[PDB]
């Protein structure tokens, strides 16, 4: 319930291989050639599926 | 679903009236008994002048139960009380008359004098 030993730099880093976060699943609006999230409304043009909002 | 410390009204003429179970028979960890299954018992309530009396250990047969039975034809018989019959070492009663209804599982398990003396077997 208490550490018997201090985690070394290497073992710390070997845990931290997976804490990362991923590039977001985005792409360019067909209307504005400007990056946006798939299946989401573009915040720049305010448009979705060829239809303003 | 009769197990240790379960009580049962007594359905026969013998001096017993109410009964407590000591031991479900038929194996090591047999913990519940159903209709047609013998159970070692004590008498906790007796009628005066009876053959059987307060404090006597005796073997006895389960004859009607709230948790009853299912038959191979898909049908279930249930009662509103758990009742027993006190018997000898053979499968015969010690009393002479039998009260209340009764189940055919006894007829299956060769408790035939009980099946006979009872008024309505269901």
């Amino acid at each position: 319930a208490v550490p018997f030993r201090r985690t070394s730099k290497a073992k710390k880093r070997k845990r931290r291989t997976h804490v990362k976060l991923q590039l977001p699943g985005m792409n360019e609006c067909s209307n504005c050639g400007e990056y946006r999230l798939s299946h989401h409304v573009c915040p720049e043009c305010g448009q979705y599926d060829g239809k303003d909002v | 679903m009769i197990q240790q410390e379960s009580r049962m009204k007594v359905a026969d003429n013998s001096g017993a009236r109410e009964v407590l179970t000591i031991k479900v028979l038929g194996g090591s960890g047999r913990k519940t008994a159903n209709i047609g299954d013998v159970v070692v018992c004590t008498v906790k309530q007796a009628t005066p002048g009876g053959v059987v009396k307060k404090g006597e250990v005796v073997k006895a047969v389960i004859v009607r139960t709230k948790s009853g039975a299912r038959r191979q034809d898909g049908s279930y018989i249930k009662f509103d009380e758990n009742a027993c019959v006190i018997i000898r070492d053979d499968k015969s009663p010690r009393g002479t008359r039998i009260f209340g209804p009764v189940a055919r599982e006894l007829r299956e398990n060769n408790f035939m004098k009980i099946v006979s003396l009872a008024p309505e077997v269901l």
Partner: protein, 122 residues
């Protein structure tokens, strides 16, 4: 079904609120779980509107909040969400069978990273 961090009272209150709000404003920004429930709720109200029976109206009035959309000088008379539901909203979809409501994904909220959506009735 979806629980929403809330016990049954609070959840039902939330849905009554959100559904009334979508009937009133016809477009609201919420979270996608709340939205994915009020689609069911609201569209089941639109059916009651499409029926128009008194029984459907009472059944809906048991759910919708009693609050005003606007006032109309006929003398100033207020209109209510139930009136807007049966007299304005649901006649719009007399010919549409189902699917009276869509959800458009907007993006994540700052203070809690919550995934937010616009829900509107077409």
């Amino acid at each position: 079904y979806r629980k929403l961090g809330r016990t049954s009272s609070q959840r039902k209150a939330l849905l009554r609120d959100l559904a009334t709000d979508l009937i009133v404003f016809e477009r609201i920004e919420t979270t996608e779980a709340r939205a994915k429930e009020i689609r069911k709720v609201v569209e089941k109200l639109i059916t009651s509107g499409k029926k128009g029976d008194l029984h459907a109206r009472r059944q809906a009035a048991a759910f919708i909040r009693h609050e005003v959309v606007e006032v109309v000088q006929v003398k100033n008379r207020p209109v209510y969400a139930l009136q807007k539901l049966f007299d304005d909203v649901a006649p719009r979809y007399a010919e549409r069978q189902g699917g009276y409501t869509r959800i458009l994904k907007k993006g994540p909220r700052r203070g809690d990273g919550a995934p937010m959506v616009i829900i509107e009735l077409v």
